[PDB]
Amino acid sequence: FTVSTTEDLQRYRTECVSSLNIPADYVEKFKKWEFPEDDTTMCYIKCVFNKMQLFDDTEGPLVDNLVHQLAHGRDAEEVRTEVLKCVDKNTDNNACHWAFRGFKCFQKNNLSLIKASIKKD
Ligand SMILES: CCCCC/C=C\C/C=C\CCCCCCCC(=O)O
Ligand SMILES: [Co+2]
């Protein structure tokens, strides 16, 4: 694993939009950090996390990878504790739902951590 840069993420966005044929109105929403509760959006988030090596469709969230991605300027073990709170089983047998659910969980108390991780260092 190697941490994804801002440039890496910008590429992964356009790749997922192209590969999944995401409509233009969704792209606009994503830009404004608006993620509708629908399968279009959930599969998009899964696609991005796949490319960033933060999520595997079978194994689920890749915890150590997430910690490295998120713990810049923070305590790694504190961040690991927060990540693990959001790690769950693939209850409803849907990788798209699964990836999105962890995303939603982590945003609740760690939004600024997410946003900080995707800005140029
Ligand atoms: C256990 C679950 C953990 C979930 C952690 C959440 C986020 C992962 C960390 C960094 C990746 C940034 C997400 C980019 C958002 C995609 C939408 C977009 O900007 O186009
Ligand atoms: Co950083």
Swiss-Prot record:
Location, primary (coarse class): secreted
Induction: (Microbial infection) Up-regulated in salivary glands following dengue virus type 2 infection.
Binding site for (5Z,8Z,11Z,14Z)-eicosatetraenoate: R13
Entry keywords, A to Z: Behavior, Disulfide bond, Glycoprotein, Secreted, Signal
GO MF terms held by the record: lipid binding; odorant binding
Tissue: High-level expression in female mouth parts, particularly in the proboscis (at protein level). Moderate-level expression in female antenna (at protein level). Expressed in testis but not in the accessory gland or ejaculatory duct (at protein level). Expressed in spermathecae (at protein level). Female salivary gland. Female chemosensory organs: antenna, palp and proboscis. Not detected in midgut.
Inactivation phenotype: (Microbial infection) RNAi-mediated knockdown results in reduced probing propensity, measured as a percentage of mosquitoes that probed within the 400 second period. Increased probing initiation time.
Residues that bind (9Z,12Z)-octadecadienoate: R13, Y44
Superkingdom, natural source: Eukaryota
Protein location: Secreted
Disulfide bonds: C16-C47, C43-C96, C86-C105
Binding, (9Z)-hexadecenoate: R13, Y44
CDD domains: PBP_GOBP
Glycan attachment residues as annotated in the record: N110
GO cellular component, one term: extracellular space
GO biological process: sensory perception of smell
Main function: Involved in modulation of blood-feeding behavior and capacity in female mosquitoes. Required for normal oviposition. Required for normal fecundity and fertility of female and male mosquitoes. Required for normal expression of VGA1 gene, which encodes the egg yolk protein vitellogenin-A1. Involved in regulation of spermatozoa development. Required for normal female longevity when mosquitoes are maintained on regular sugar meal. Binds long chain fatty acids. (Microbial infection) Facilitates shedding of dengue virus type 2 particles into mosquito saliva. Does not affect dengue virus type 2 replication or infection prevalence in midgut and salivary glands at 14 days after blood feeding.
Subunit organization: Monomer in solution.
Similarity annotation: Belongs to the PBP/GOBP family.
The protein's name in its UniProt record: Odorant-binding protein 22
Source organism: Aedes aegypti
Lineage of the organism: Eukaryota, Metazoa, Ecdysozoa, Arthropoda, Hexapoda
